[PDB]
Amino acid sequence: ATFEIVNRCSYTVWAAASKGDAALDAGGRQLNSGESWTINVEPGTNGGKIWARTDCYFDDSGSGICKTGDCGGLLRCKRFGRPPTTLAEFSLNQYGKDYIDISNIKGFNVPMNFSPTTRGCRGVRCAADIVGQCPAKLKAPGGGCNDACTVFQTSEYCCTTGKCGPTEYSRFFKRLCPDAFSYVLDKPTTVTCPGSSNYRVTFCPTA
C-alpha cells in the first residue's frame, strides 16, 4: 500500500513511520512546509503508526533529538515516538479489510487529517487547536498537549486493569476531536476500508 505524507504546516516537521519493532519504509524524513513524502507499506502490516516530530536537530549519522515524538534520538524511527504525538494508526489487509484511525491516547502535537486516496470509505481528522486550549497540567514544556496517562501514571488514566472510564482530561480531547480516540476504552472511531487501499496523511490540514 502507498501512503503520501504531506506537510501543510507552516513549520518544518520530521515525519515518522514505524510498526513498533521496525521502521516502515525509510522510517523518517524531514518535510519542509509543502513537501510530500510517499512511502510503501507492505500489505498485512499490523499496528503501523505515522506521526510528526517537531523541533528536531540531527547530525551526520542521523542522531539527535526532537522536542515531540522523538524515537530514541533517530531520524529513521525503529520504535514509537515519545509523547505528545497525534497518531495516525492503521492495520492493513486484516481478513480483506483495512482499519484506520487517529488517536489522542498518546497526546496531541500536530493537527492531522488521515484520508484514503482510493474508494469506499471516509477519512478522519483532528485539526482543532488542542495545544492552545490544553489544560495547564497537560501542557508539555516542549510544545504539545500530553495525555493524562503520560502525565499522572494512574490505573484510571492508563486503563491498566482493563477497566476505566472517561475522565475530565479525556473529555477535553474528545470535545475538540470527536473523531479521535481520547482514552483507551473510548467508543471506537475506527474506519473500515477495502483491503489494499492507499492513503494520504496531511499535517495541518486546514491551517
UniProtKB/Swiss-Prot annotation:
Keyword Disulfide bond among record annotations: yes
- Cellular localization per UniProt: Cytoplasmic vesicle
Cystine links in this protein are 9-204, 56-66, 71-77, 121-193, 126-177, 134-145, 149-158, 159-164
Read off the Gene3D superfamilies from this record.
Answer: Thaumatin (2.60.110.10)
Q: Which CDD domains match?
A: TLP-P
Tell me the keywords, alphabetical order.
Cytoplasmic vesicle, Disulfide bond, Signal, Taste-modifying protein
Q: Which residues cross the membrane?
A: none
Give the protein family.
Belongs to the thaumatin family.
Record-given protein name: Thaumatin I
